[PDB]
Amino acid sequence: TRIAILGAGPSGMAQLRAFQSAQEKGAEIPELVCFEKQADWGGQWNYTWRTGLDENGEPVHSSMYRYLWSNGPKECLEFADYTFDEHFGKPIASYPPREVLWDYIKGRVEKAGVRKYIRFNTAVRHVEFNEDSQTFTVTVQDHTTDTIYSAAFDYVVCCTGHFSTPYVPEFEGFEKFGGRILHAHDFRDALEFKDKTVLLVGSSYSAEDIGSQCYKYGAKKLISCYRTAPMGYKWPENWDERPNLVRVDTENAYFADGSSEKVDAIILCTGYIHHFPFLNDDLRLVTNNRLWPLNLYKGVVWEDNPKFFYIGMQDQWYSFNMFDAQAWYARDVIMGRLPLPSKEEMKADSMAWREKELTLVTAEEMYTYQGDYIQNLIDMTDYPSFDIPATNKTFLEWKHHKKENIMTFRDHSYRSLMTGTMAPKHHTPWIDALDDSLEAYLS
Amino acid sequence: TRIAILGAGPSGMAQLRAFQSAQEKGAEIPELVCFEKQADWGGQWNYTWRTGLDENGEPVHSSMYRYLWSNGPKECLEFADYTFDEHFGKPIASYPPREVLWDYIKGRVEKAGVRKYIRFNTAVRHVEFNEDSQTFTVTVQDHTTDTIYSAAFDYVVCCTGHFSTPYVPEFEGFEKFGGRILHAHDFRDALEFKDKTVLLVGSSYSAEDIGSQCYKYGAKKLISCYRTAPMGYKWPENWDERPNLVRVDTENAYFADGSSEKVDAIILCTGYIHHFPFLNDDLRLVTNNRLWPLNLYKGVVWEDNPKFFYIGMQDQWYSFNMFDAQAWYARDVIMGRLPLPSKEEMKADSMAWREKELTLVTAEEMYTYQGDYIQNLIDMTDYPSFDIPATNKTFLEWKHHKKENIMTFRDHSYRSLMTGTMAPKHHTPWIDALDDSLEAYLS
Ligand SMILES: Cc1cc2nc3c(=O)[nH]c(=O)nc-3n(C[C@H](O)[C@H](O)[C@H](O)COP(=O)(O)OP(=O)(O)OC[C@H]3O[C@@H](n4cnc5c(N)ncnc54)[C@H](O)[C@@H]3O)c2cc1C
Ligand SMILES: Cc1cc2nc3c(=O)[nH]c(=O)nc-3n(C[C@H](O)[C@H](O)[C@H](O)COP(=O)(O)OP(=O)(O)OC[C@H]3O[C@@H](n4cnc5c(N)ncnc54)[C@H](O)[C@@H]3O)c2cc1C
Ligand SMILES: NC(=O)c1ccc[n+]([C@@H]2O[C@H](COP(=O)([O-])OP(=O)(O)OC[C@H]3O[C@@H](n4cnc5c(N)ncnc54)[C@H](OP(=O)(O)O)[C@@H]3O)[C@@H](O)[C@H]2O)c1
Ligand SMILES: NC(=O)c1ccc[n+]([C@@H]2O[C@H](COP(=O)([O-])OP(=O)(O)OC[C@H]3O[C@@H](n4cnc5c(N)ncnc54)[C@H](OP(=O)(O)O)[C@@H]3O)[C@@H](O)[C@H]2O)c1
Ligand SMILES: [Cl-]
Ligand SMILES: [Cl-]
Secondary structure, eight states: OEEEEEOOSHHHHHHHHHHHHHHHTTOOOOEEEEEOSSSSSOGGGSOOSOOSBOTTSSBOOOOOOTTOBOSSOGGGSOBTTBOHHHHHSSOOOSSOBHHHHHHHHHHHHHHHTOGGGEEOSEEEEEEEEETTTTEEEEEEEETTTTEEEEEEESEEEEOOOSSSEEOOOOOTTTTTOOSEEEEGGGOOOGGGGTTOEEEEEOSSHHHHHHHHHHHHTTOSEEEEEESSSOOOOOOOTTEEEEEOEEEEOSSEEEETTSOEEEOSEEEEOOOEEOOOTTBOTTTOOOOOSOSOOTTEETTTEETTOTTEEEOSOSOOSSOHHHHHHHHHHHHHHHTTSSOOOOHHHHHHHHHHHHHHHHHOOSHHHHHHHHHHHHHHHHTTSSSOOOOHHHHHHHHHHHHHHHHHOTTSGGGOOOBOSSSOOBOOOOSSOGGGOOOOOHHHHHO | OEEEEEOOSHHHHHHHHHHHHHHHTTOOOOEEEEEOSSSSSOGGGSOOSOOSBOTTSOBOOOOOOTTOBOSSOGGGSOBTTBOHHHHHSSOOOSSOBHHHHHHHHHHHHHHHTOGGGEEOSEEEEEEEEETTTTEEEEEEEETTTTEEEEEEESEEEEOOOSSSEEOOOOOBTTTTOOSEEEEGGGOOOGGGGTTOEEEEEOSSHHHHHHHHHHHHTTOSEEEEEESSSOOOOOOOTTEEEEEOEEEEOSSEEEETTSOEEEOSEEEEOOOEEOOOTTBOTTTOOOOOSOSOOTTEETTTEETTOTTEEEOSOSOOSSOHHHHHHHHHHHHHHHTTSSOOOOHHHHHHHHHHHHHHHHHOOSHHHHHHHHHHHHHHHHTTSSSOOOOHHHHHHHHHHHHHHHHHOTTSGGGOOOBOSSSOOBOOOOSSOGGGOOOOOHHHHHO
């Protein structure tokens, strides 16, 4: 009895870890094969200089850029089964850079020795369900041998993410503009925009942070523009918020303001689409980015075919944490530990969650909702319960720190909820930590 | 009886045109469906500002950039069945810009009324051959309805090109460099590199022309580097050729010279790979870019499954011309007008062509080879024969003009081989024609 895991990001890693933990406690687990299109694990967190299409011609997966740092409290994403203390030996600050959290998540799966289940440099092409044999045929392309083969599986868990395929709206005049146009996804070294004016379309995390990053590394000027509401923070002297872009010139941008500016480069921070080109409509999740996509029982079991699962397909306040709660749940249903109700009951449950999701107005209500969801997940499972209300509170502080000063929210520290140890302040304040390396952050 | 044509570029267009011509002459043709992922036809020639992944999340197909102009004599790519005179009403110069040749190729298929066979905004996902029914199942994703469906076909003609999936080699230090790194494929407006130093890796057409374009629109400095041999032309004052790049710094490039330069942006002009993610190994052509890929009988019929065809998969001296000769051939075999020999005879014939291909040393020998190939194709077919030796000679002149001056080769003019009418000189010399529009070129 055999399981396919699509992707070796945090969720892929989590799913392997879940099975490995059940085996460590002495259960008999199914056989596992995890397919990954990259040469190494970590999903988003595996940095690449590459852009658009990778060396094999697959879409480039990582949206991460130089100088990226955790954008929420470390302690809100700590593994309940593998603490920051265990991995690093010492306390560290609360907003580690990319390389640092990369090392962290790799650490857990290194210790667990699950790498052996992964076939790297292998792209998933197709997943089909065979009614007659009640199994899945997974077709993949191995770019090391340049071969396309397929295998049979009893269950499939999809962990391929939903922040990689850019949503890139068109604006009148883009075909005439003379500077670079790119999506947030293709943003790499902030230095390429030193001494330049940068338009940033959009009003969410990518806008906030890519702006910040351009500012931090010496851009002349920054302009955000928003579809519905303005971001709201107090931006430095050389950064304006204007209502939405409307058209574009050989060298200028034009807003619903009626205003005008010379612009060097436009970065579309307009989000991503859920895109699964390896799935047919019988298995393919279709949703906008949100806290409660429909058709997932407990947010992970595919309602039309419960032998297929999805991990981390929700919008994220929590992350690593959540994927774990999900992977532990998925594994337990795969292992027969948690039998599924009938299809009608699944559908009714999911509707109840959706109703509640529509109730949400404030940031606080939103992550508390994710919190309740995770709470419901971890109570069903092996997975160590931890203080969710206390994690909610940490998000609340984090929100405040951003409102106080959007350029110094990374300079604060919070209490781990696994160990209790409060985090030190970091040796360099954010604006001045120009070196982004593990090396430089840990010394 | 039903045919699938994958792609509506020049080759897709040609294939439709071939069938339509046979019907015009009163034959009964099969049913046709052509699938195209873009919103309009023209293949490479359909310009987009987009980069990496398109609005639906498909790889962006076009490699074409602002200010692109035909890089060979117009008269070497003229349709034998739809002349430049017929389309434009008047003579024009010999190196029309993108928009101009786009209008031209669209013209022929507009006149033919074949648009009706095309399902746009539809990406081909998979082609499978069913041994039992001796038919193909083609699975596509319609991005207008967001639906994935599949249809049965008796033959399939693949026209999806091989200059879209970039070959992008890695160079030590790319992960540290602070300026933009891109493939020729993502190159759009030359203005983004005004007053900048641009490294261009590679020594072929893309290197030549992207360099030229950067120069023409005011780049500070240009550096080409070559893997095997230097391009050879006399570059302007602010452009050097040096041997291959070896590593890269925060802001510098280092070559096998031992030399060093501050660099603002690197453009990889390292070519493309034949990539068919919608085919399994039974149907998937695997080759490097060359005049004679193996496994194609007469360079178009797939030897392991002769109900599957490939158009325009060869490296190109000739182009539009050749695709026609190929499409007409493909159609005549589909229509039963040209029965195929046994598999052993096919294999033997292809070997003879390969042997001769390996003989080739000089540019002249190379396009003369393609010429002999095309000659062999058009003699079997309906397709109007035209003067190939005379077209060869035109390539020869073209070669000379490039050797004389690589910046003014586009300023000469040549004799059409269809009509005999010599082409006028163009109202503006190349270096000065800053406006790239149809509008501005034809007035
Ligand atoms: C720019 C950016 C910054 C972020 N920063 C933070 C942060 O600071 N803190 C936080 O908590 N969260 C952050 N996130 C949220 C992020 O979603 C999670 O941290 C985490 O990366 C989710 O991991 P995942 O495994 O579920 O998906 P991913 O990390 O995207 O991994 C999916 C994996 O599937 C693979 N894959 C996809 N398709 C195929 C295929 N066809 N065949 C084979 N393999 C395939 C990919 O290669 C990848 O390895 C950020 C996201 C982005 C995009
Ligand atoms: C930058 C550049 C400049 C060039 N300049 C010249 C020139 O000046 N003169 C010249 O003679 N030749 C030139 N060429 C050569 C070029 O190969 C031909 O002119 C011509 O474009 C070949 O057309 P094609 O139909 O065979 O392939 P393409 O033009 O690439 O068209 C292929 C079609 O297939 C579609 N497609 C691909 N995959 C899918 C899918 N999965 N599902 C649905 N549709 C799909 C694409 O959208 C596209 O429309 C140039 C090529 C490039 C890249
Ligand atoms: N660690 C980091 O520093 C970091 C950096 C970048 C990203 N991230 C992560 O990446 C994920 C998503 O980031 P995201 O901000 O790119 O996607 P997102 O969270 O879904 O934000 C989508 C944004 O794009 C805007 N938008 C969409 N279409 C638009 C249009 N046509 N015109 C103008 N604006 C438009 C939306 O406007 P509306 O609000 O009106 O809908 C919204 O503000 C999050 O998980 C985040 O944690 C993290
Ligand atoms: N109309 C226009 O002006 C225009 C503009 C651009 C492109 N095009 C078209 O696009 C097509 C291909 O253009 P192309 O030049 O990009 O591809 P190409 O013709 O196949 O050229 C490949 C080049 O990349 C070089 N290269 C490969 N790997 C390398 C490496 N690791 N390091 C350094 N160099 C490397 C090769 O070096 P080697 O020589 O040693 O093998 C070769 O010079 C042609 O059909 C051309 O007509 C046209
Ligand atoms: Cl362990
Ligand atoms: Cl006609």
